[PDB]
Fold:
Amino acid sequence: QAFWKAVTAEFLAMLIFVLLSLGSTINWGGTEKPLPVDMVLISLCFGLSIATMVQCFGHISGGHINPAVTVAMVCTRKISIAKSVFYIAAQCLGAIIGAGILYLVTPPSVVGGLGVTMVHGNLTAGHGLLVELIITFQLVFTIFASCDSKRTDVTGSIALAIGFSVAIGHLFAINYTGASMNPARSFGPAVIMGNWENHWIYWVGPIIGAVLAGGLYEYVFCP
Amino acid sequence: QAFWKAVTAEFLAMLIFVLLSLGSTINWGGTEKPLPVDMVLISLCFGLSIATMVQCFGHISGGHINPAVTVAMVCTRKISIAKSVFYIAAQCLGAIIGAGILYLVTPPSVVGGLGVTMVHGNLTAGHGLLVELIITFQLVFTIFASCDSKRTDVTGSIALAIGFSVAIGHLFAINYTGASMNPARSFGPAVIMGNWENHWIYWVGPIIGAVLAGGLYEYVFCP
Amino acid sequence: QAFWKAVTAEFLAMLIFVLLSLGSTINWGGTEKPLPVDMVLISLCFGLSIATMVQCFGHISGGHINPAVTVAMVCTRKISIAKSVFYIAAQCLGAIIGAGILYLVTPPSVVGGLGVTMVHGNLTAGHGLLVELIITFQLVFTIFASCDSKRTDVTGSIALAIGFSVAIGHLFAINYTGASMNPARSFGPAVIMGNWENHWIYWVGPIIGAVLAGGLYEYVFCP
Amino acid sequence: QAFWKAVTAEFLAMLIFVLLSLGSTINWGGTEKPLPVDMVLISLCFGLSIATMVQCFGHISGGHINPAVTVAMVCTRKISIAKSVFYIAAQCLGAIIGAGILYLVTPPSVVGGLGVTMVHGNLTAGHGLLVELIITFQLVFTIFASCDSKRTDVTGSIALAIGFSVAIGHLFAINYTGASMNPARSFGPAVIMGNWENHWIYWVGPIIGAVLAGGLYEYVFCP
Amino acid sequence: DIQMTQSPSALSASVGDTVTITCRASQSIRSWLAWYQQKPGKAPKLLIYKASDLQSGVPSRFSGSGSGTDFTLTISGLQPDDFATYYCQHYNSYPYTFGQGTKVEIRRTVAAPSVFIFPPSDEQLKSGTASVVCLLNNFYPREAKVQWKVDNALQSGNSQESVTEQDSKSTYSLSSTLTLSKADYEKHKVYACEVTHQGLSSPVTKSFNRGE
Amino acid sequence: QVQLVESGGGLVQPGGSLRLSCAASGFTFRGYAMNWVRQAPGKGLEWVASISGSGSITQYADSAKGRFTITRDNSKSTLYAHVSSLRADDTAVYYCAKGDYVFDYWGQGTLVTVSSASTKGPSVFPLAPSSKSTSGGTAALGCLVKDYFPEPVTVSWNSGALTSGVHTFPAVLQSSGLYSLSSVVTVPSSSLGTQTYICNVNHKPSNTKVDKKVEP
Structure:
């Protein structure tokens, strides 16, 4: 059945995204000898992993790799309600296993926070919600625009265009809120590490940004 | 009306561009331990944001996201006079709101100059105009060449080709003039913080380079 | 005979790939004051060289440039048994010559390890095998998915997609095991420098990940 | 006359290339407190400038933007003898004017060597010729492979593939010979600064690598 | 290598005082410095890493600062527990090197030593060896010196001394042993050790004669 | 719950070989680097050797090169240090400590003594209070233990009856390789001649018990 293959692809694609992307955020100098944080390291690894996962699994399950976009398709009647609940559960499961594997293969002295997205200490969670709302809005708008059948001017790799949308989201808001823009990417390591601080802004944030982006594109700009 | 949908897209496209790109240039080390300025960070975030903005909004308003290129189309008779004045006003307002949002979400300890483009202290303002003139000339030439209907050898993503043209402009002229190549990108943060030093070179500069690039290509190289 | 041209293409493609990629990892700071290891430096050189080499030699030999993928085609019955033994031998010879040339042109004070892949001191070799099993799995899956004739939604440069798959593997696993994901890339410098520590994980690892990725795509996802 | 347009395009495209690329190599720390050399910064600016200029001027003159490749076309009988002498002269003049502009706009305290290519102090000029020979070989081979009409598997942006070939050439041989791979790029700043040390290896080197790459593809691999 | 020197070698302070010790590095090691607290007969305890960060479970009164080559460890409010020996450790590059150690001692008023000299017993003379001991008891501070006088002629190079630690009820105590053969004992008649202290108005010499 | 237990120390002839063990529990021994630190008697700490989590990378101090070999066995969570060609200087108290850069967990310490001489505890030498010494009013007396080996010896006066004013100095290693110390206690001058003062010496390795009379 193609339904079981689509859900399995989402679980597998989302799992690889966590393990590769969160591993790049590991500070190998540790707490006692912190190395300077390389921003292009984190941004490109996160950005290109999505572009790789869409290339790998775009034709099997649609290549969501995000609970936020899955809600957006439901809000625009692109996937069924029963379809979304299996996508979201698989995406949440993929991050939990994906972060668990990383915790297994990382030396204890350099594990740190395991890529868990904290808000900046001087930044209020109210402002942190707004940041998550926007960087996800540009991601979902890009996905809808890149994957629009009615368009005829789309050139180049669609996956790469989606990948670079994620990268600029990381290049902006790593020290604001960690640039989660993926509820599963924040749920996975949080379950493993048991860190649950301001976690609601990482679900309410991207979802509201996705709904605005999907609704604006489908019902205002290109109806 | 499609006219009001194009102006709204231009306002919104640059608002995301200004907010995301100016956010990347924020120095999070503060004024007491200023971290070294990552220059690939600034070039890539600025370069890829334009590529992302053209991908999302290219088929709605043309994806100008710059008053300099908007003037160039008028000189080459690609848009009407009435359309340009609404585009230029929309792009200027988008930057002002885009920078204003960033000022609200950036902690005061790391706000700094908010990405406002100063000429180098050792560099004369007369030399600043020349640097701004050249980097905009290559940008407008790329846009005109990439978006030519008569061409048959254009391959790959048009938005990515435009995006990397901005990136090499930043990899050159960040330390010279700030690498604006976008008059409204300089107008936005300047209004917010009231810093108005050598601001005329960021309007006279890019516009002259844009007119030179558009006029040469449409009337000499490919008439 | 195209058979001999295909084998010589694989030898020459590997020779350029090893020489250019291993050269970028050379630490010019020396042993008396090692410079910080630039991280996007190594990832892009390894990643983009594959994209360059697949573009150069894709239509001549298939552009395997890896003993791991060459085994996967045999498992999926894309090349014959006699086809692979000449490819694997040519790939191993290319790395030996490619790394041998680099040893001649590199000054002795900065040779160091000559890019030989080492597992982290605090990392168990058992976990090192698992990391190679996964970073090669995403590489082989990308290659199989990108080069699927039955697909229709494939856009952009196929070589570039393969190149970025290698880059994210390096963006993750340089400090774990060196991110080899290429048995030939590890065999070459090991022969030249005589370092043979944990070398079995660099053959067993990628091959198991390659066979798993090829079998899953060909016989489960897209049969 | 299309002949005069092609030569002018070669002069202008080649001129802009050094202005942006040689500007990025300027060390703004000065001779007092030099900053660490950002290695990805130099490669991307050099790599993406070529990709940008092939996109801009590929349909007007062919976008050789290199004396080495221009010689290769004559060897492979793609352009005439009279075409080459005007191409090479325009390219040499473009670098001299382009580097001269950079000298005028760069503050004297940070001019330094003006991007002049030098062999490493511990590296013999004999090994310097070999290093430049190989990096130009992979560049010319990529250009010939990407621009082959008989190929049917070429996907993605041709200019971007040529650009990334330059980037990996710079990603390897910045510290070896300066990664010139372009006799015009070396002639320009050398004339302006009057520095003529080991300059013959930057003409004999890349040209021999170009002839080998062009002849091998056109007469052995794809005749 | 990188040599790490501490200053002062030993300092005196009272409970509630604020003191600072300095660690000097031969070359720059930036913020790669560690501090340890060790009490006699016990393993060292980590206090500071990164030269400004406090290890968990350590009271906040300990504070470190400095970077490059100059590092200072400061204690805001001294406590009875705080009297120990402090070491500075380097971990910028191998090999890791410790400091020479700085000892913190309780501060009290200056005390005058009590000097007693004990002639060797006759039972020791049957063993062919003669050892004479003169005692400096309950003297503060640590600074003291012993000079052995033999028939108005100084003798040195064959003396061994041992000093106790801070008293639990906080002076010191010094004992010096002058060993020599029985033949050397028989050819002299008068022995004395000369000790001067900062709490003594004049140097005090205790002398004795054989069989007297 | 994290603790490190050391073993393998004690006396050893010069030029021999020794095996030091450090049993570790309560933490993932495989993933943490282990170090050896020694402290000579009366001196500061001295870092000796380092080993990675998997034992792939080992580093040594300049004085520890060649003679000392550090190896770890993660199967039994024990850290070993091969101490070869022991010299008289090499005596110290060795600590095993974890930490790649800063050591946070230390063991109790194992004392290694490198000395050829081995002489059982001889008799004691009393220090009588002289006639002109007791005339001051604060007469002091004591007994001296000499040429005993090895450490330690405990000296008690009247089986612990006299404890106030008792000072026992740390022992000093003589040039002949033998230890020696004295215990001196001050007493009121008027108490001289009464309240018999006897010092009891217990040398556990030699099982020697000597009681000495102190009289003027």
